[PDB]
Design an enzyme around this catalytic site. Structure first.
Site, PDB file in Angstrom:
ATOM      1  CG  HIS A  41      -0.529   0.424   2.472  1.00 45.74           C
ATOM      2  ND1 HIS A  41      -0.248  -0.492   3.456  1.00 45.74           N
ATOM      3  CD2 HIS A  41      -0.417   1.667   2.994  1.00 45.74           C
ATOM      4  CE1 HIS A  41       0.163   0.204   4.498  1.00 45.74           C
ATOM      5  NE2 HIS A  41       0.008   1.514   4.286  1.00 45.74           N
ATOM      6  CG  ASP A  89      -0.012  -3.818   2.817  1.00 45.82           C
ATOM      7  OD1 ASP A  89       0.421  -3.361   1.745  1.00 45.82           O
ATOM      8  OD2 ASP A  89      -0.260  -3.108   3.819  1.00 45.82           O
ATOM      9  N   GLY A 183       3.070   6.280   8.867  1.00 46.23           N
ATOM     10  CA  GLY A 183       4.455   6.593   8.529  1.00 46.23           C
ATOM     11  C   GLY A 183       5.394   5.443   8.863  1.00 46.23           C
ATOM     12  CB  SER A 185       2.761   1.595   6.722  1.00 49.38           C
ATOM     13  OG  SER A 185       1.642   1.766   7.578  1.00 49.38           O
ATOM     14  N   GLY A 186       5.274  -0.497   6.351  1.00 55.89           N
ATOM     15  CA  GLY A 186       6.302  -0.995   5.452  1.00 55.89           C
ATOM     16  C   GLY A 186       7.611  -1.303   6.129  1.00 55.89           C
TER      17      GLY A 186
HETATM   18  C1  LIG Z   1      -0.438   0.716  13.706  1.00 54.53           C
HETATM   19  C2  LIG Z   1      -0.791   1.747  12.663  1.00 54.53           C
HETATM   20  C3  LIG Z   1      -1.892   2.574  12.860  1.00 54.53           C
HETATM   21  C4  LIG Z   1      -2.314   3.425  11.842  1.00 54.53           C
HETATM   22  N1  LIG Z   1      -3.363   4.320  11.767  1.00 54.53           N
HETATM   23  C5  LIG Z   1      -3.375   4.936  10.565  1.00 54.53           C
HETATM   24  C6  LIG Z   1      -4.344   5.982  10.070  1.00 54.53           C
HETATM   25  C7  LIG Z   1      -5.790   5.645  10.534  1.00 54.53           C
HETATM   26  N2  LIG Z   1      -6.173   4.357   9.981  1.00 54.53           N
HETATM   27  C8  LIG Z   1      -6.814   4.238   8.816  1.00 54.53           C
HETATM   28  O1  LIG Z   1      -7.111   5.204   8.116  1.00 54.53           O
HETATM   29  C9  LIG Z   1      -7.200   2.843   8.407  1.00 54.53           C
HETATM   30  C10 LIG Z   1      -8.523   2.412   8.474  1.00 54.53           C
HETATM   31 CL1  LIG Z   1      -9.702   3.401   9.272  1.00 54.53          CL
HETATM   32  C11 LIG Z   1      -8.923   1.189   7.970  1.00 54.53           C
HETATM   33  C12 LIG Z   1      -7.977   0.327   7.417  1.00 54.53           C
HETATM   34  N3  LIG Z   1      -8.399  -0.948   6.916  1.00 54.53           N
HETATM   35  C13 LIG Z   1      -9.542  -1.243   6.239  1.00 54.53           C
HETATM   36  N4  LIG Z   1      -9.598  -2.510   5.953  1.00 54.53           N
HETATM   37  N5  LIG Z   1      -8.448  -3.095   6.472  1.00 54.53           N
HETATM   38  C14 LIG Z   1      -7.755  -2.140   7.020  1.00 54.53           C
HETATM   39  C15 LIG Z   1      -6.639   0.717   7.370  1.00 54.53           C
HETATM   40  C16 LIG Z   1      -6.272   1.961   7.852  1.00 54.53           C
HETATM   41 CL2  LIG Z   1      -4.620   2.450   7.697  1.00 54.53          CL
HETATM   42  C17 LIG Z   1      -3.942   7.379  10.532  1.00 54.53           C
HETATM   43  C18 LIG Z   1      -4.126   8.468   9.690  1.00 54.53           C
HETATM   44  C19 LIG Z   1      -3.765   9.745  10.094  1.00 54.53           C
HETATM   45  C20 LIG Z   1      -3.208   9.950  11.336  1.00 54.53           C
HETATM   46  C21 LIG Z   1      -3.013   8.877  12.181  1.00 54.53           C
HETATM   47  C22 LIG Z   1      -3.395   7.601  11.791  1.00 54.53           C
HETATM   48  N6  LIG Z   1      -2.323   4.441   9.860  1.00 54.53           N
HETATM   49  C23 LIG Z   1      -1.652   3.489  10.619  1.00 54.53           C
HETATM   50  C24 LIG Z   1      -0.553   2.663  10.437  1.00 54.53           C
HETATM   51  C25 LIG Z   1      -0.108   1.795  11.429  1.00 54.53           C
HETATM   52  C26 LIG Z   1       1.035   0.861  11.138  1.00 54.53           C
END
Ligand SMILES: Cc1cc2nc([C@@H](CNC(=O)c3c(Cl)cc(-n4cnnc4)cc3Cl)c3ccccc3)[nH]c2cc1C
Ligand code: NA
Lengths: 234, 55
Positions: A41, A89, A183, A185-186
């Site tokens: 991703h 992923d 940030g 991720s990966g």
């Molecule tokens: C541990 C960790 C937590 C994180 N939180 C965020 C995002 C908020 N999360 C999302 O938007 C989200 C949603 Cl709601 C659904 C799915 N999803 C659907 N089907 N399968 C999966 C996937 C995602 Cl990434 C964010 C965005 C902005 C600020 C802070 C966090 N990135 C992250 C990466 C890591 C490694």
């Protein structure tokens, strides 16, 4: 990484950072001098990616950084973003020129499928990255690291409305406060085996970083070991 | 002495062998040591090793 600590220079020498229109949008791990493993991703659009190995403080020049351009992206053959952006992923990045291996730029070990799964079962890995240091907060300047324990599948399924397939695992703390975040991720989830680190996971996704009752979701590397070895052989 | 018990005392990988013995092995860039259990670097910068002084 929320609730982590500053890495010392050369502490995670397999760590790379991916830079694009935004810096430190994702992490990666060194497989060998020409290949990086990351999350699919992170690299799903055909945008130019800069890989930086030997990085420590992303807003200071420290001598050890090796910057390379990505010439080929290999998402896993089962990855399909139109169906699910977070299933299978995993992707491989081929660099334009080989990295120069040294104490700051060293690959991560990758065991066979059986041993990668045994290592995950030890139940404690290290994650690292330049991701957000608070939920919805600023990115890290200095590389962060954190030890995360494996969370049982049932607890993990009860924590989120999204699907968790058998090729993913959950890690984190029941009380919150410590987790990977956007940030990161990966990047790598690694298990230390008598002083040698092995790649056991890829940092994948989550929701409210470090919120009590939520966990970080990771790709199980054991499922993809054969494909990594085949695609990255020099 | 089997790979199920303390990994056959192998530092990295274990394989069960004949006469209730084990054969240890290591990942790429390491050599199996003379003690038949430990893994020694066989290249200048072997994978997964921290070599910068952490002091
Ligand atoms: C541990 C960790 C937590 C994180 N939180 C965020 C995002 C908020 N999360 C999302 O938007 C989200 C949603 Cl709601 C659904 C799915 N999803 C659907 N089907 N399968 C999966 C996937 C995602 Cl990434 C964010 C965005 C902005 C600020 C802070 C966090 N990135 C992250 C990466 C890591 C490694
Ligand atoms: Na730097």
């Amino acid at each position: 990484v929320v609730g982590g600590e500053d890495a010392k220079p050369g502490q995670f020498p397999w760590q790379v950072v991916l830079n694009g229109k935004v810096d430190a949008f994702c992490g990666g791990s060194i497989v060998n001098e020409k290949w990086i493993v990351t999350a699919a991703h992170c690299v799903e659009t055909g945008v130019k990616i800069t890989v930086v190995a030997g990085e420590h403080n992303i807003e200071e020049t420290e001598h050890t950084e090796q910057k390379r351009n990505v010439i080929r992206i290999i998402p896993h053959h089962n990855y399909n973003a139109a169906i699910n952006k977070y299933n299978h992923d995993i992707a491989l990045l081929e660099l334009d020129e080989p990295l120069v291996l040294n104490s700051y730029v060293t690959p991560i070990c990758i065991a066979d499928k059986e041993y990668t799964n045994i290592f995950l079962k030890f139940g404690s890995g290290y994650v690292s990255g330049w991701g957000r240091v608070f939920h919805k907060g600023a990115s890290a300047l200095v590389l962060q690291y954190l030890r995360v324990p494996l969370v049982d599948r049932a607890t993990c399924l009860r924590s989120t409305k999204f699907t968790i397939y058998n090729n993913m695992f959950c890690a984190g703390f029941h009380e919150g406060g410590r987790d990977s975040c956007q940030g990161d991720s990966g990047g790598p989830h690694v298990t230390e085996v008598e002083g040698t680190s092995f790649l056991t996971g890829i940092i994948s996704w989550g929701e409210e970083c470090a919120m009590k009752g939520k966990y970080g979701i990771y790709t199980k590397v054991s499922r993809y070991v054969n494909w990594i070895k085949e695609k990255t052989k020099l | 002495v089997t790979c199920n018990i303390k990994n056959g005392r192998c530092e990295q990988f274990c394989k069960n062998s004949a006469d209730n013995k084990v054969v240890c092995s290591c990942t790429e860039g390491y050599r199996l040591a003379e003690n038949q259990k430990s893994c020694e670097p066989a290249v200048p910068f072997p994978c997964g090793r921290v070599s910068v002084s952490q002091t």
